[PDB]
Amino acid sequence: ALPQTVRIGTDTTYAPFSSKDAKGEFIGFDIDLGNEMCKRMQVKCTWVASDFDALIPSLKAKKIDAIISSLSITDKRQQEIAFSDKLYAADSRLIAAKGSPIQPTLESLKGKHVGVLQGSTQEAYANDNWRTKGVDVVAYANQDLIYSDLTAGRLDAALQDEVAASEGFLKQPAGKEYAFAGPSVKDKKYFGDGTGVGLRKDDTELKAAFDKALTELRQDGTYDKMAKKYFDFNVYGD
Numbered sequence: 352a353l354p355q356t357v358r359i360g361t362d363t364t365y366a367p368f369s370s371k372d373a374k375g376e377f378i379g380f381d382i383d384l385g386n387e388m389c390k391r392m393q394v395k396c397t398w399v400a401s402d403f404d405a406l407i408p409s410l411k412a413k414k415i416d417a418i419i420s421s422l423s424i425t426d427k428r429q430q431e432i433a434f435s436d437k438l439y440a441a442d443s444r445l446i447a448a449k450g451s452p453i454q455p456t457l458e459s460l461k462g463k464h465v466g467v468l469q470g471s472t473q474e475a476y477a478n479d480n481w482r483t484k485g486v487d488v489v490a491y492a493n494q495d496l497i498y499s500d501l502t503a504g505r506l507d508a509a510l511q512d513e514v515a516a517s518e519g520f521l522k523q524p525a526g527k528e529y530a531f532a533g534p535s536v537k538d539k540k541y542f543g544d545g546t547g548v549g550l551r552k553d554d555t556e557l558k559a560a561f562d563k564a565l566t567e568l569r570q571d572g573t574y575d576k577m578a579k580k581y582f583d584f585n586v587y588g589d
């Protein structure tokens with residue numbers, strides 16, 4: 352008994368995973384994976400755009416049936432929702448102006464203004480570790496606002512998923528004068544293990560269908576065909 356239409360929520364400000372083109376159509380690797388899985392599940396799927404911090408509330412309230420939005424699988428989130436198997440890996444990394452001395456450390460960042468997406472694992476990490484100790488951690492409604500304020504000089508640094516910053520900003524016109532500041536921030540407790548489809552705990556039939564379709568499209572080589580459209584390295588990690 353899967354729904355006739357599966358309603359999938361995503362936050363369309365995280366290119367190359369989820370964004371909108373000039374006509375307002377949904378585009379990106381998350382959209383490609385969701386649509387291929389819906390095709391293999393033989394269900395119809397509707398995409399619903401939402402701010403990132405409204406996604407798990409909307410899911411719990413049944414306004415959407417699944418979340419595909421670079422949603423990291425963490426211990427905290429598993430207390431509330433269920434996840435498909437891993438869609439791809441996601442590490443966190445700081446970005447700042449080229450030549451910046453900034454490092455992901457308290458000593459480097461105390462007194463700096465650091466942007467993080469509201470509702471993200473990065474906001475959790477930065478609030479506990481940095482905001483309490485005097486770093487000015489600023490939470491934003493979406494990631495595009497973070498990049499705009501960084502280039503405006505209102506932020507000194509921003510923490511987000513590494514590949515989103517790389518492909519969605521650093522390799523773009525707008526990020527030419529910016530770079531990663533230090534290596535990926537590893538913290539198992541905060542950042543979890545890769546991203547997955549977020550689902551209500553009791554929708555075990557829907558999880559089984561997403562997991563089976565994901566195995567099948569990885570198996571026959573469709574995942575790698577799709578990933579190569581955006582990435583030249585293995586995004587899945589393994």
Ligand SMILES: N[C@@H](CCCC[NH3+])C(=O)O
Pocket residue numbers: 362364365403420421422423424441468470471472473512
């Ligand atoms: N992967 C991070 C950021 C995803 C942001 C997507 N708009 C998290 O799960 O919180």
